[PDB]
């Protein structure tokens, strides 16, 4: 899921 991927990445990026 594109949305799921973005969400995880966002938090990871900090």
Swiss-Prot record:
Source lineage: Eukaryota, Metazoa, Chordata, Craniata, Vertebrata
GO cellular component, one term: extracellular region
Top-level lineage group: Eukaryota
Function (record text): Has antibacterial activity against the Gram-positive bacterium S.aureus, and the Gram-negative bacteria P.aeruginosa and E.coli. Has antifungal activity against C.albicans. No hemolytic activity has been detected.
Main location: secreted
Tissue distribution of the protein: Expressed by the skin glands.
Modified residues (Glycine amide): 14
Record key words, sorted: Amidation, Amphibian defense peptide, Antibiotic, Antimicrobial, Fungicide, Secreted
Organism (species): Boana punctata
A biological process term (GO) from this entry: killing of cells of another organism
Subcellular location: Secreted
Protein name: Hylaseptin-P1
């Amino acid at each position: 899921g594109i949305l799921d991927a973005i969400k995880a990445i966002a938090k990871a990026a900090g």
